[PDB]
Amino acid sequence: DPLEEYCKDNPETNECRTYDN
Amino acid sequence: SDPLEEYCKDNPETNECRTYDN
Amino acid sequence: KLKVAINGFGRIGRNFLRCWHGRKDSPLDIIAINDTGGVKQASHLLKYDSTLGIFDADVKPSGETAISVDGKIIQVVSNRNPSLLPWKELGIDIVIEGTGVFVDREGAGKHIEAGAKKVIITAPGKGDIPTYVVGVNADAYSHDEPIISNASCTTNCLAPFVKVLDQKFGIIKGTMTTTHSYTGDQRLLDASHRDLRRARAAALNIVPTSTGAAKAVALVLPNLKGKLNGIALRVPTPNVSVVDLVVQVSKKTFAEEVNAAFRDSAEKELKGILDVCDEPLVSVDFRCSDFSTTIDSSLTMVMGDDMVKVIAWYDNEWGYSQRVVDLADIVANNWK
Amino acid sequence: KLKVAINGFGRIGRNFLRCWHGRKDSPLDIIAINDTGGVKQASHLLKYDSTLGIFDADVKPSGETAISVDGKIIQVVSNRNPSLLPWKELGIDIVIEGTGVFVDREGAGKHIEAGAKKVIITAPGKGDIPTYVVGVNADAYSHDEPIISNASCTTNCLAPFVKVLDQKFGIIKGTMTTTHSYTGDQRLLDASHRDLRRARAAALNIVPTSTGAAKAVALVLPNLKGKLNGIALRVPTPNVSVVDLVVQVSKKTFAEEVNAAFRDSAEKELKGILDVCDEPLVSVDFRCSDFSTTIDSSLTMVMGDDMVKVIAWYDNEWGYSQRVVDLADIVANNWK
Amino acid sequence: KLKVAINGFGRIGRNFLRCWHGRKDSPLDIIAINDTGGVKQASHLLKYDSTLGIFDADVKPSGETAISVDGKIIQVVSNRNPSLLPWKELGIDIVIEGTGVFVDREGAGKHIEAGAKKVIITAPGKGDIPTYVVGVNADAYSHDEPIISNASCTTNCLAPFVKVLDQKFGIIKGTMTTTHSYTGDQRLLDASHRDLRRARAAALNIVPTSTGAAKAVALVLPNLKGKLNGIALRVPTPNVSVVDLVVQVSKKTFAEEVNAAFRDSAEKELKGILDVCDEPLVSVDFRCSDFSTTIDSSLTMVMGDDMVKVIAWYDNEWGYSQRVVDLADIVANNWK
Amino acid sequence: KLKVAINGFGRIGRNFLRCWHGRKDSPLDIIAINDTGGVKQASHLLKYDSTLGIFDADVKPSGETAISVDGKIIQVVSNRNPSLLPWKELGIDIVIEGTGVFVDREGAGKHIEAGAKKVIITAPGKGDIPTYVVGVNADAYSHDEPIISNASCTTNCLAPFVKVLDQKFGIIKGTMTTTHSYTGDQRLLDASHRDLRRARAAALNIVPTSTGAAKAVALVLPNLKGKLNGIALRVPTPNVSVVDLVVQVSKKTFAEEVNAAFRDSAEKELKGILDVCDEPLVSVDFRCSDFSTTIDSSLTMVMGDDMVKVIAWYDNEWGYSQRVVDLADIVANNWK
Ligand SMILES: NC(=O)c1ccc[n+]([C@@H]2O[C@H](COP(=O)([O-])OP(=O)(O)OC[C@H]3O[C@@H](n4cnc5c(N)ncnc54)[C@H](O)[C@@H]3O)[C@@H](O)[C@H]2O)c1
Ligand SMILES: NC(=O)c1ccc[n+]([C@@H]2O[C@H](COP(=O)([O-])OP(=O)(O)OC[C@H]3O[C@@H](n4cnc5c(N)ncnc54)[C@H](O)[C@@H]3O)[C@@H](O)[C@H]2O)c1
Ligand SMILES: NC(=O)c1ccc[n+]([C@@H]2O[C@H](COP(=O)([O-])OP(=O)(O)OC[C@H]3O[C@@H](n4cnc5c(N)ncnc54)[C@H](O)[C@@H]3O)[C@@H](O)[C@H]2O)c1
Ligand SMILES: NC(=O)c1ccc[n+]([C@@H]2O[C@H](COP(=O)([O-])OP(=O)(O)OC[C@H]3O[C@@H](n4cnc5c(N)ncnc54)[C@H](O)[C@@H]3O)[C@@H](O)[C@H]2O)c1
């Protein structure tokens, strides 16, 4: 879960980036 | 008939002929 | 002539810039770029591309803030906050949201706060953002819409041939799997990530990833609602991908007719969009294909007379960008 | 004790020999190997594998004609033509024909003519010929049968679960696709091949190869006759593949249920043959899995109530090499 | 009986745990792990690995802030600020810095201000940080050293044979090039990077990059100050690397006498750190090699009597990690 | 107008044709192709290519034994025995022996013994065949030489700057290493090969392999006889290689001075054969370079005054082929 939150403010980071392909 | 296919008949284990199904 | 700016100069953005540079007599005029990295980096990566190859254009710095592409001067700004871009200052008519982080109205809306009149998200929009796949429902666009989406690359592939499949043989329901070239969203080696699939070595494995680019078809094709869904598999090829569709039409048929049907679209209402390939090529042969979807006729199947299976090749980066330019042209022409 | 010989020390010929080595107490006793290659050029080729790592076992050649796995001398011969193989003079009951060169009776027969009682075609059989999948019908094999055919790895996986699905929902029609690691039949770079596709550079392409594994199901399961079909997709992976099955059925069902059937057959009729994965994994995770078919629970989709899509991973080399080591116990123990 | 924390559960923090796991009687005890993610990724990626495969052990979450590895339970923290880590809370004794962003004295001292009594950078240090290499000088460590460095993967391979080379022939000057596997520092596809080269698709390219290992060796091999230099070549292999060293020696010699010397060493002092391989192997054949340096004796040439060229193999992830532990133990065994 | 025929339509064979094709005012008119395959494989592979792209030219067949490129027809023969080739009726003047099998008077001669007048082995001649490297010694070609060699790809790269270096600093003795792309000669997956190392999967290893480049240089640059040695390292890249050279020179120098020299030569005698790149580029960027050798100025180093390290890039298929076309022009210009 820690990561989910991190991502919410750093959507473009390595451990977040999510593309529809 | 093409050349490669005839060759393949006799030399099936070649690089240019090997054909594994899956 | 509209003034464009590219926000987020990553894979899509650069492809876009080249796709655009390609068009003859374009309604667009790219005047600005913005990426976190600055001029020096923008110019390099634009010139040298491990995929697209070496840009056959005269790229090089202009002043200390802009770059010149065949004499065309493009300002290169650098702000992580869309809200603070000189759009109002540069007179930007449209923004190509290519960052992949500003997809909802709040996000992209900032570009309008910043002074630009329209955002065109290069990915699945969020919220009630109007989506469009050129050649299907790109006609639905009205100038009232400031922020719009262009869907995903996969969605831009299915829509055109699913439009043909449901149109003619009427689609009852279907599933889909796209064997896709990995993308920037995956790790090079096993390092943390939110999606435990994408956290694994991209160029080593076959990674499966929940898409949603299937259901998305509903947006551009009102009908298909709840009928489609699917998944994707990521494979060790940096570019070009393929769509695997298994529909269930009502009107029974056979391959020769299916592909026959496609060929007709190909010259009718989907010229420059849909393409059918009869020669036995492989992924890489479709690098730089201006077609959102190319069918592999020699692969079409039909089981039980009604269970239709089609195969489609698409250049995830290039083609989609070619579309994005078209969509912009559309925007630029129905400019109220 | 049922003296065994490996003809065609390829990926399988070598993989197989290793499964065997690791068997708790096999009835088979491999004594000879016949490869076009060399003897030491085979002892080394065994000890070191790029896909399986280092073969744990003292692999030092013994004399200029044999090897010596863990002390067990294993004569090594080299003759292209089968008919000249020392099977009679050596005393061979079972020959593992893993060359994919001789697939039919006419060909494979050259083994019996040389002195081989019963042979095993590690690949789909050609023309008329007994096919049996270890776990779906490794019983229909009568000792009257002199030449078997352990089918293809795509089939030996796309069957143990095609069974669970037709006899519990009743498969009507149906199609399939397999995203498979490339294999020896594909060129490393663009050379000539009788088929203009396996000709293309392996590791840098998604190559669509024609497969039989589909109609191949309509053999080890008479039932599915004329129903299953589909194609194959070669991709930049050295090992481990995945089948994407999509069949339409009668009995209404949902994705979740579909997964319980499998979990059941998992510890019953398909124990050690079929397994279900409730984890979010990738290809490399299933390397050296003894299950000729492992379902990925999280991917199962069910559109329209009946049309169901299931995903199964299979280590095409090692997994298959296990079923083959078994269709040999099914012979050795059930030996007249 | 020594509490250990792993800051940065990345490719190195993880091999360390697994290196340590397989340890016969460790003086250490991995108390916790810290990164950005928690147990979800911590656990998942410790059980799986697109390089080291499945970890044989019961790796399962143990609450929502800890994990269970074969019974023993390891806390799992998640703050990016080392000052905030409960190092005093859990009473950690030594920290494995593998975040790659706290290599500087100021930054590494944060674990010390948060509790930990000693830190170890899994990389070269910046500031007043003692650098140690096992087999070369880790026998100069002093218990009063709060923070130290284990150098890099490359220097660790290089330092060993340079020690033998210099001590037995006297190096005048020399150069080295390490053909190294890509790393998490590079990009999957052309993405931004401070380094315009590492910013290029790591699996499609041979990427030149600088290395400070050649000057680093003088840190642990004083007599080498200013005699070496070199660069690195990043090639599309996930792990394992090779350094290509060329040195002008003082004492004229020959390929065979050199290897002879390398052998004497792998037996007397560098026994266990250096290993002269004789088999005609390849990169993969070196996975998990517990040696810092394995010299391919077959490759060893000697041009014109004093220009020596040596080629040494090493596992950047695994071989290094073992050294880390080893040094970690050297720290343990000097405590107080 | 010398008629040409290409023996062995492999990588070099097709790359050769494409090179020639784009030449303005050529003295060569190629009208014949031989390879185990027929018009099928040929027409297709000259059009599609996983490395050079889709050959931009009308590539369709003519007769079931010939093809046409932008008009001009070219017979497509298919006999594995050169002695039996229609070289005498097609008035064949020069043959491009690139099957990599007929590389000694013993072999290539057969081409003359079939009607052809000259042979150019796209590889080192076996034994004592006149070897030429354009820009270095091809001007030393003489018409009464029936069979000649164009050296290997590595030698053509290496020769040009080794020439400059010797000329301006004097090579005393050096060492080389070329990290090379994998070639057809390698196995896709661990299969049999005369060489154990080349037997291992190309797209997954760092493969140590012997080269005769350091030696072959002495042929075209006589003062280098007995002064150079070195190995090769095949890596997971499909094209474009790099040679890492380290020499001990007589004139003390510094990096800047070496780069200066290469540039002087690049603009004069080695105009079009040698280049110096002053940008942070990677492998892919060098694809399709007409230069035999291009220096990575930034990488150049000089240790201890006279130990120079230079790193050059080259496209082994396209680069080489351009030189083979060149040698052929030379031949055609001194015809008698
Ligand atoms: N790869 C494809 O073929 C493809 C196809 C269709 C749609 N898409 C979608 O397009 C989006 C981008 O994909 P991509 O492959 O170009 O990715 P990418 O990683 O190459 O591009 C992201 C770029 O945005 C920049 N960026 C990040 N945060 C920013 C900020 N706040 N301000 C400005 N720039 C910022 C990055 O530095 C980088 O230049 C994703 O949402 C993806 O789903 C991708
Ligand atoms: N590896 C897999 O994924 C796989 C799995 C299941 C079934 N198969 C099937 O197995 C067959 C072979 O596959 P493989 O991966 O082992 O390939 P392979 O190329 O490594 O094996 C062929 C081997 O046979 C030898 N050989 C060739 N001709 C011979 C002859 N006339 N006499 C003696 N030896 C000869 C070769 O030197 C080689 O060692 C194909 O039919 C394929 O469809 C492959
Ligand atoms: N890969 C190799 O071969 C290798 C060899 C020797 C030394 N090293 C060194 O090891 C270190 C890491 O390299 P790696 O290859 O394992 O990389 P990596 O990306 O896999 O690991 C870095 C890890 O640190 C975490 N991290 C980053 N910032 C953090 C912070 N502020 N707080 C907590 N965790 C944080 C990341 O999420 C990740 O798990 C670097 O110092 C590197 O130079 C790497
Ligand atoms: N690609 C390179 O990097 C490169 C560079 C320089 C020199 N070379 C040399 O050039 C030669 C060819 O190399 P390539 O890479 O193009 O190889 P390749 O394998 O792609 O092409 C050789 C071709 O000749 C055919 N062939 C085999 N035996 C034949 C016969 N008896 N008669 C007619 N055709 C036959 C093959 O089927 C194939 O199409 C080799 O000697 C190689 O060492 C290669």
Coordinates of C-alpha atoms in Angstrom, one line a residue, chain F:
Chain F
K1 CA 29.6 -2.4 -67.7
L2 CA 31.0 -5.6 -66.1
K3 CA 28.3 -8.1 -65.4
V4 CA 28.0 -9.2 -61.8
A5 CA 26.6 -12.3 -60.1
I6 CA 26.0 -12.7 -56.3
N7 CA 26.8 -16.2 -54.9
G8 CA 25.1 -16.7 -51.5
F9 CA 22.1 -14.4 -51.0
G10 CA 22.7 -14.2 -47.2
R11 CA 23.1 -11.0 -45.2
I12 CA 26.2 -9.7 -47.0
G13 CA 24.7 -10.9 -50.4
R14 CA 21.5 -8.9 -50.1
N15 CA 23.2 -6.0 -48.2
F16 CA 25.6 -5.9 -51.2
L17 CA 22.8 -5.6 -53.8
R18 CA 21.1 -2.9 -51.9
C19 CA 24.4 -0.9 -51.5
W20 CA 25.1 -1.2 -55.2
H21 CA 21.5 -0.2 -56.1
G22 CA 21.8 3.2 -54.5
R23 CA 25.1 4.0 -56.2
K24 CA 25.1 6.8 -58.7
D25 CA 27.0 6.0 -62.0
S26 CA 28.3 2.5 -61.2
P27 CA 30.5 0.5 -63.5
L28 CA 28.7 -2.6 -62.3
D29 CA 25.5 -4.2 -63.6
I30 CA 24.5 -7.1 -61.5
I31 CA 22.3 -9.6 -63.2
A32 CA 22.4 -13.0 -61.4
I33 CA 21.9 -14.6 -58.0
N34 CA 22.7 -18.0 -56.6
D35 CA 21.7 -19.6 -53.2
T36 CA 20.2 -22.9 -52.1
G37 CA 16.8 -21.2 -52.3
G38 CA 14.9 -19.8 -55.3
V39 CA 13.1 -16.8 -56.5
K40 CA 10.8 -17.2 -53.5
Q41 CA 13.2 -16.7 -50.7
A42 CA 15.2 -14.1 -52.8
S43 CA 12.4 -11.7 -53.9
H44 CA 11.1 -11.6 -50.3
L45 CA 14.3 -11.2 -48.4
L46 CA 15.6 -8.5 -50.7
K47 CA 12.4 -6.6 -49.9
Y48 CA 11.9 -7.3 -46.3
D49 CA 14.7 -7.0 -43.7
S50 CA 14.6 -7.0 -39.9
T51 CA 17.7 -4.7 -39.9
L52 CA 17.7 -2.6 -43.0
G53 CA 13.9 -2.2 -43.3
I54 CA 11.7 -2.7 -46.3
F55 CA 13.9 -2.2 -49.4
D56 CA 12.4 0.8 -51.1
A57 CA 12.2 -0.5 -54.7
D58 CA 9.8 -2.6 -56.8
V59 CA 10.7 -6.1 -55.7
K60 CA 8.6 -8.7 -57.5
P61 CA 9.5 -11.9 -59.4
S62 CA 9.8 -12.5 -63.2
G63 CA 9.5 -16.1 -64.4
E64 CA 9.6 -18.8 -61.8
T65 CA 13.4 -18.3 -61.8
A66 CA 14.4 -14.5 -61.8
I67 CA 13.2 -11.2 -60.3
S68 CA 13.1 -7.5 -61.0
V69 CA 14.2 -4.5 -59.0
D70 CA 12.9 -1.2 -60.3
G71 CA 12.8 -2.8 -63.7
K72 CA 16.1 -4.5 -64.4
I73 CA 15.6 -8.2 -64.3
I74 CA 18.1 -10.5 -62.6
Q75 CA 18.3 -14.2 -63.1
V76 CA 17.9 -16.1 -59.8
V77 CA 19.7 -19.5 -60.2
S78 CA 19.8 -22.1 -57.4
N79 CA 22.7 -24.5 -57.6
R80 CA 24.9 -25.4 -54.5
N81 CA 27.8 -26.4 -56.8
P82 CA 29.5 -23.4 -58.4
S83 CA 31.2 -25.5 -61.1
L84 CA 27.8 -26.0 -62.6
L85 CA 26.9 -22.2 -62.8
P86 CA 25.6 -20.5 -66.0
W87 CA 28.5 -18.0 -65.6
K88 CA 29.7 -18.7 -69.1
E89 CA 26.5 -17.8 -70.9
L90 CA 25.4 -14.9 -68.7
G91 CA 28.8 -13.4 -69.7
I92 CA 29.4 -13.1 -65.9
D93 CA 32.5 -11.0 -65.3
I94 CA 32.8 -10.8 -61.5
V95 CA 31.4 -13.1 -58.9
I96 CA 30.7 -12.0 -55.4
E97 CA 31.5 -15.2 -53.5
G98 CA 29.6 -14.7 -50.2
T99 CA 28.4 -18.2 -49.3
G100 CA 31.1 -18.3 -46.7
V101 CA 32.1 -21.8 -47.9
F102 CA 34.1 -21.3 -51.1
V103 CA 37.0 -19.3 -49.7
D104 CA 40.1 -20.7 -51.2
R105 CA 41.4 -21.0 -54.8
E106 CA 40.3 -24.6 -54.3
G107 CA 36.7 -23.4 -54.1
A108 CA 36.0 -20.0 -55.6
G109 CA 38.0 -21.2 -58.6
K110 CA 35.0 -23.2 -59.5
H111 CA 33.4 -19.9 -60.4
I112 CA 36.0 -19.4 -63.1
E113 CA 35.8 -23.1 -64.0
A114 CA 32.1 -22.1 -64.8
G115 CA 32.6 -19.1 -67.1
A116 CA 33.2 -16.3 -64.7
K117 CA 36.4 -14.3 -64.9
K118 CA 36.9 -13.0 -61.3
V119 CA 35.8 -13.9 -57.8
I120 CA 35.7 -11.6 -54.8
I121 CA 35.4 -13.5 -51.5
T122 CA 33.4 -11.4 -49.0
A123 CA 35.7 -12.9 -46.3
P124 CA 39.4 -13.7 -45.6
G125 CA 40.8 -15.9 -48.4
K126 CA 41.9 -19.3 -47.1
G127 CA 45.6 -19.8 -47.7
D128 CA 47.2 -17.2 -49.9
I129 CA 44.7 -15.2 -51.9
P130 CA 45.4 -11.5 -52.5
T131 CA 43.6 -9.6 -49.7
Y132 CA 42.6 -6.0 -50.1
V133 CA 41.1 -3.4 -47.8
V134 CA 39.9 -0.2 -49.5
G135 CA 41.6 3.0 -48.4
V136 CA 44.5 1.0 -47.1
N137 CA 45.8 -1.2 -49.9
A138 CA 43.2 -1.9 -52.6
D139 CA 45.1 0.4 -54.9
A140 CA 47.6 -2.4 -55.0
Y141 CA 45.2 -4.7 -56.8
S142 CA 46.5 -6.1 -60.2
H143 CA 44.3 -7.4 -63.0
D144 CA 46.0 -10.9 -63.4
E145 CA 44.6 -11.8 -60.0
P146 CA 41.6 -14.2 -60.6
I147 CA 40.6 -14.8 -57.0
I148 CA 40.9 -12.1 -54.3
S149 CA 39.6 -11.4 -50.8
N150 CA 38.1 -8.2 -49.3
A151 CA 39.1 -9.3 -45.7
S152 CA 36.7 -9.6 -42.8
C153 CA 34.4 -6.9 -41.5
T154 CA 36.6 -6.5 -38.4
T155 CA 39.8 -6.1 -40.5
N156 CA 38.2 -3.4 -42.7
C157 CA 37.3 -1.4 -39.6
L158 CA 40.6 -1.9 -37.8
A159 CA 43.0 -1.5 -40.8
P160 CA 42.1 2.2 -41.5
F161 CA 42.8 3.7 -38.1
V162 CA 45.6 1.3 -37.3
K163 CA 47.1 2.7 -40.4
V164 CA 46.8 6.3 -39.3
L165 CA 48.1 5.4 -35.8
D166 CA 51.2 3.6 -37.2
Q167 CA 51.8 6.5 -39.6
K168 CA 51.6 9.2 -37.0
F169 CA 52.9 7.5 -33.8
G170 CA 54.3 4.2 -34.8
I171 CA 52.6 1.0 -33.4
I172 CA 55.2 -0.9 -31.4
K173 CA 52.8 -3.7 -30.5
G174 CA 49.1 -3.7 -29.6
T175 CA 46.1 -5.6 -28.4
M176 CA 42.5 -5.6 -29.7
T177 CA 39.1 -6.8 -28.8
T178 CA 35.9 -6.4 -30.8
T179 CA 32.5 -6.6 -29.1
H180 CA 30.7 -7.9 -32.2
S181 CA 27.0 -8.3 -33.0
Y182 CA 25.9 -12.0 -33.4
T183 CA 26.0 -13.4 -36.9
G184 CA 24.3 -16.2 -38.8
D185 CA 27.2 -18.5 -37.8
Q186 CA 25.8 -18.6 -34.2
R187 CA 23.1 -20.9 -32.8
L188 CA 19.7 -19.4 -31.8
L189 CA 19.5 -21.8 -28.9
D190 CA 22.3 -24.1 -27.5
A191 CA 22.7 -26.4 -30.5
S192 CA 25.7 -28.1 -32.1
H193 CA 28.5 -26.1 -33.7
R194 CA 32.1 -26.9 -34.4
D195 CA 32.9 -24.3 -31.7
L196 CA 31.5 -24.9 -28.2
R197 CA 31.2 -21.1 -27.5
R198 CA 29.6 -20.2 -30.8
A199 CA 27.2 -23.2 -30.1
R200 CA 25.5 -21.2 -27.2
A201 CA 22.4 -19.0 -27.8
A202 CA 23.5 -15.8 -29.5
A203 CA 20.7 -13.6 -28.2
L204 CA 21.4 -14.3 -24.5
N205 CA 25.2 -14.4 -24.1
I206 CA 28.5 -12.7 -24.2
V207 CA 30.3 -15.1 -26.4
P208 CA 34.2 -15.2 -26.5
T209 CA 35.4 -16.0 -30.0
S210 CA 38.6 -16.1 -32.0
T211 CA 39.4 -13.6 -34.7
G212 CA 42.2 -13.3 -37.2
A213 CA 41.8 -9.6 -37.7
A214 CA 44.9 -8.5 -35.7
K215 CA 46.8 -10.8 -37.9
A216 CA 45.0 -10.2 -41.2
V217 CA 46.0 -6.5 -40.8
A218 CA 49.6 -7.3 -41.5
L219 CA 48.5 -8.4 -45.0
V220 CA 47.3 -5.0 -46.1
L221 CA 49.6 -3.1 -43.6
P222 CA 53.0 -5.0 -43.8
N223 CA 54.6 -3.0 -41.0
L224 CA 52.0 -4.4 -38.6
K225 CA 53.1 -8.0 -39.2
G226 CA 53.6 -9.7 -35.9
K227 CA 52.6 -6.6 -33.9
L228 CA 48.9 -7.2 -33.1
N229 CA 46.6 -9.9 -31.6
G230 CA 43.2 -9.9 -29.9
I231 CA 39.8 -11.6 -29.5
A232 CA 36.1 -11.0 -30.2
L233 CA 33.1 -11.0 -28.0
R234 CA 29.8 -11.8 -29.6
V235 CA 26.9 -10.0 -27.9
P236 CA 23.1 -10.0 -28.1
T237 CA 22.9 -7.3 -30.8
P238 CA 21.8 -8.0 -34.4
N239 CA 24.1 -5.5 -36.2
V240 CA 26.8 -2.9 -35.8
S241 CA 30.0 -3.8 -33.9
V242 CA 32.8 -2.1 -32.0
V243 CA 36.6 -2.7 -31.9
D244 CA 38.5 -1.7 -28.7
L245 CA 42.2 -1.3 -29.6
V246 CA 45.2 -0.6 -27.3
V247 CA 48.6 0.1 -28.8
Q248 CA 52.0 1.1 -27.5
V249 CA 53.3 3.8 -29.7
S250 CA 56.8 5.4 -30.3
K251 CA 55.8 9.1 -30.3
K252 CA 54.4 10.2 -26.9
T253 CA 51.0 11.7 -27.4
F254 CA 47.8 12.6 -25.8
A255 CA 44.1 11.8 -26.5
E256 CA 43.4 15.1 -28.2
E257 CA 46.3 14.7 -30.6
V258 CA 45.2 11.2 -31.7
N259 CA 41.6 12.4 -32.4
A260 CA 43.2 15.3 -34.3
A261 CA 45.1 12.9 -36.5
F262 CA 42.1 10.7 -37.2
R263 CA 40.2 13.8 -38.2
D264 CA 43.1 14.9 -40.5
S265 CA 43.0 11.5 -42.1
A266 CA 39.2 11.5 -42.2
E267 CA 39.2 14.7 -44.3
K268 CA 42.1 13.5 -46.6
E269 CA 43.4 10.1 -47.6
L270 CA 40.8 8.2 -45.6
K271 CA 38.0 10.4 -46.8
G272 CA 34.9 8.3 -46.8
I273 CA 36.6 5.3 -45.1
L274 CA 37.3 6.8 -41.7
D275 CA 35.2 9.1 -39.5
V276 CA 35.3 10.6 -36.1
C277 CA 32.1 11.0 -34.1
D278 CA 32.1 13.6 -31.5
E279 CA 28.7 12.7 -30.0
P280 CA 27.5 10.4 -27.2
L281 CA 26.0 7.9 -29.6
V282 CA 25.3 4.2 -29.2
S283 CA 25.3 1.2 -31.5
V284 CA 21.9 1.6 -33.3
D285 CA 22.9 5.1 -34.3
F286 CA 25.7 3.7 -36.5
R287 CA 23.4 1.5 -38.5
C288 CA 23.8 2.1 -42.3
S289 CA 27.2 4.0 -41.9
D290 CA 29.1 4.1 -45.2
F291 CA 32.3 4.4 -43.2
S292 CA 34.6 1.4 -42.6
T293 CA 35.5 2.9 -39.3
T294 CA 34.1 5.8 -37.2
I295 CA 36.0 6.8 -34.0
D296 CA 34.4 7.7 -30.7
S297 CA 36.6 10.7 -30.0
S298 CA 35.2 11.0 -26.5
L299 CA 36.3 7.5 -25.7
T300 CA 39.9 7.8 -26.8
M301 CA 42.5 7.6 -24.1
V302 CA 46.2 7.7 -23.7
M303 CA 47.8 6.2 -20.6
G304 CA 51.3 6.8 -19.4
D305 CA 52.2 8.7 -22.6
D306 CA 52.4 5.9 -25.2
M307 CA 49.7 3.4 -24.4
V308 CA 46.8 4.6 -26.6
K309 CA 43.2 3.3 -26.5
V310 CA 40.9 3.9 -29.4
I311 CA 37.3 2.7 -29.9
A312 CA 35.7 2.6 -33.4
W313 CA 32.3 1.7 -34.6
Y314 CA 31.2 0.0 -37.8
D315 CA 28.1 -1.6 -39.4
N316 CA 29.4 -5.1 -40.2
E317 CA 26.9 -5.9 -42.9
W318 CA 26.1 -2.6 -44.6
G319 CA 29.5 -1.1 -43.8
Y320 CA 31.4 -4.0 -45.2
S321 CA 29.2 -4.4 -48.2
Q322 CA 29.8 -0.8 -49.2
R323 CA 33.5 -1.6 -49.3
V324 CA 32.9 -4.8 -51.4
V325 CA 31.0 -2.7 -53.9
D326 CA 34.0 -0.4 -53.9
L327 CA 36.6 -3.1 -54.4
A328 CA 34.5 -4.3 -57.3
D329 CA 34.6 -0.8 -58.9
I330 CA 38.4 -0.9 -58.6
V331 CA 38.4 -4.2 -60.4
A332 CA 36.1 -2.9 -63.1
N333 CA 38.3 0.1 -63.5
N334 CA 41.5 -1.8 -64.1
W335 CA 39.9 -4.5 -66.3
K336 CA 42.1 -6.2 -68.9

